[PDB]
């Protein structure tokens, strides 16, 4: 017949470096446009307030 009585102490030092990257997107609004345009008059009379 035996009887074992025990005790423990403990430390722990945990250092962590986390890198993360995320790319969100919406399928309805993927792209935005921009046009570079000129206006040409090949006619004979001038035209005003051109839209």
């Amino acid at each position: 017949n035996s009887s074992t009585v025990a005790i423990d102490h403990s430390l722990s030092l945990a250092g962590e470096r986390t890198w993360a990257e995320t790319m969100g997107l919406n399928t309805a609004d993927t792209a935005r446009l921009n046009a570079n345009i000129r206006y040409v008059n090949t006619g004979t009379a001038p035209i005003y307030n051109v839209l």
Binding site: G24, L25, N26, T27, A28
Partner: protein
């Protein structure tokens, strides 16, 4: 003033002092002159608003 009640007088219609885009068979006073406009749909574009 307009026997066909279209927005053009009898005299303008027989004289020719009219919008020339009026068809020639509509240049008779008993012939009405009016637009008929209807829209056709060539293509659909659906976009799923999912992000």
């Amino acid at each position: 003033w307009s026997t066909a009640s279209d927005p053009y007088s009898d005299f303008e219609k027989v004289t020719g002092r009219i919008d020339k885009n009026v068809s020639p068979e509509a240049r008779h006073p008993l012939v009405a002159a009016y637009p008929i406009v209807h829209v056709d749909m060539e293509n659909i574009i659906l976009s799923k608003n999912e992000d």
